[PDB]
Amino acid sequence: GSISTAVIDAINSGATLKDINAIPDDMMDDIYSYAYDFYNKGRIEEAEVFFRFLCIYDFYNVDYIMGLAAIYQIKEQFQQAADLYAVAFALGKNDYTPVFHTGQCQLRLKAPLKAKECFELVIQHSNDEKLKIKAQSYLDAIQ
Amino acid sequence: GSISTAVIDAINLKDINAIPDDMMDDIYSYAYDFYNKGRIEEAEVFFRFLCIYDFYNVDYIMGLAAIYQIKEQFQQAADLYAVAFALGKNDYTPVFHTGQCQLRLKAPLKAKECFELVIQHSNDEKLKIKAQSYLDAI
Ligand SMILES: NC1=NCc2ccccc21
Ligand SMILES: NC1=NCc2ccccc21
Ligand SMILES: [Cl-]
Ligand SMILES: [Cl-]
Ligand SMILES: [Cl-]
Ligand SMILES: [Cl-]
Ligand SMILES: [Cl-]
Ligand SMILES: [Mg+2]
Questions:
Q1: Residue A90 touches chain B, beta carbons under 8 Å
Q2: Which residue in A19, A104, A131, B43 is deepest, having the highest Cβ count within 10 Å?
Q3: DSSP string for residues in A17-42
Q4: Where in the chain are disulfide-linked cysteines found (chain B)?
């Protein structure tokens, strides 16, 4: 999957497509715009193909990763989604939505202590009061 | 033999339990021995092998990222530290080392983001002291 493909790329350490500037920036921006248009039209499969393409070319891109993670969560590939949300967080995503959505994923993965850690982190650090209410709703049901 | 012939049929590695747990532990220990002896190229072979066998093992991945960092392959190290962070979810040591990498890449705003993530979320006091020292210098 996405994570294993990234690890194998990193192991092999070769010269990469982006290292070659294989695709210009304004074309990558365009492909991202198309990926999101598929996504907004419900064309989850076209969106996934485009986001997977983007993440092969530039995996360490917050916006690409967040888009693919959302599609994995929709497709109930909850572990891949959780992992990619955490990648986005390490890369600098500047809010707690990756953590909130990872909590949802961990619940579906029957990992309630991980989920609790995610929602508590939202409540303790987010400045989105509505997101914190949603996080508390989830915490209240983990018993 | 029977075991290899079955593993290869299925392949076409860890899901199959191809290598016993205690032998994997031994290889990890030997990799760390090479590393501690300064034999970085030997350590790198062993950590690459470990990571191919179990690409979701945070400590195996951290070992390879440390070698990329030692070898001044700073972007490759930073990239792998992000995966390492993601697999363990709540250990900010890879993020700390990513901050070091970003400084060497002359990306101080990225470094500051890394060290701030450590300060705000880690419960590792010794790590946070190091992170704050860097923050004091940037
Ligand atoms: N449990 C988690 N701590 C930090 C984080 C970031 C993204 C997803 C999960 C977590
Ligand atoms: N697939 C995986 N994502 C996170 C993780 C940790 C340990 C083993 C497997 C996984
Ligand atoms: Cl937030
Ligand atoms: Cl075993
Ligand atoms: Cl060597
Ligand atoms: Cl590099
Ligand atoms: Cl996890
Ligand atoms: Mg074990």
A1: yes
A2: B43
A3: TGGGT-S-HHHHHHHHHHHHHHHHTT
A4: none
